[PDB]
Amino acid sequence: VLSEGEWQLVLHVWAKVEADVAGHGQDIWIRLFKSHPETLEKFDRFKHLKTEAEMKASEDLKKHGVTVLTALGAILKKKGHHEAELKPLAQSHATKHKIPIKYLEFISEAIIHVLHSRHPGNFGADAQGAMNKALELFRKDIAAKYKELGYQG
Numbered sequence: 201v202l203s204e205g206e207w208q209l210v211l212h213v214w215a216k217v218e219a220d221v222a223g224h225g226q227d228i229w230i231r232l233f234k235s236h237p238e239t240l241e242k243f244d245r246f247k248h249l250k251t252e253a254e255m256k257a258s259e260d261l262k263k264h265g266v267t268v269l270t271a272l273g274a275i276l277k278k279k280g281h282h283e284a285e286l287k288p289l290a291q292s293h294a295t296k297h298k299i300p301i302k303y304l305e306f307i308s309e310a311i312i313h314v315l316h317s318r319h320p321g322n323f324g325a326d327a328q329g330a331m332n333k334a335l336e337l338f339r340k341d342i343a344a345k346y347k348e349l350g351y352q353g
């Protein structure tokens with residue numbers, strides 16, 4: 201459970217991210233595919249992308265990034281009361297996409313790195329601490345649902 205102060209640190213930096221959702225979406229995903237290429241195999245629609253240039257030019261990847269960050273944003277804004285939002289997400293990711301928890305840890309790493317680079321003034325040690333805590337909360341609850349749904353993760 202995060203404190204009200206910790207949530208504020210999270211939503212404060214997120215308000216900046218929302219000024220350019222598409223741009224942040226691309227940076228985060230490209231960072232992920234470059235740092236952990238195996239994740240690219242989960243996308244039968246992006247597995248063909250070879251270079252960072254091709255990725256930055258993909259309109260579909262950009263739209264996916266927006267869809268992803270929008271869903272994450274709605275969750276964070278619930279400040280822990282994200283039960284309703286998580287169920288449908290856990291079902292598709294556990295039964296259809298089959299995304300293991302390890303991959304959620306990898307993207308969490310990408311989110312932090314991108315925020316740290318683009319928003320240094322609003323992403324200090326305390327702010328990163330809160331963001332990490334929020335993402336771990338997300339991962340903890342998703343992994344729980346996974347078990348309930350019959351997927352080890």
Ligand code: HEM
Pocket residue numbers: 239240242243244245264267268269271272288289292293297299303304307
């Ligand atoms: C920060 C956590 C993430 C959030 C909030 C998120 C959100 C979403 C949403 C809302 C969709 C579309 C609706 C749906 O299928 O449920 C989606 C699709 C998808 N996600 Fe996630 N996702 C996350 C992380 C990941 C990761 C780490 C992977 C893979 C390494 C992944 C792989 C996919 C795939 C394969 C699709 C289907 C895309 C397509 O084929 O059109 N997601 N995700």
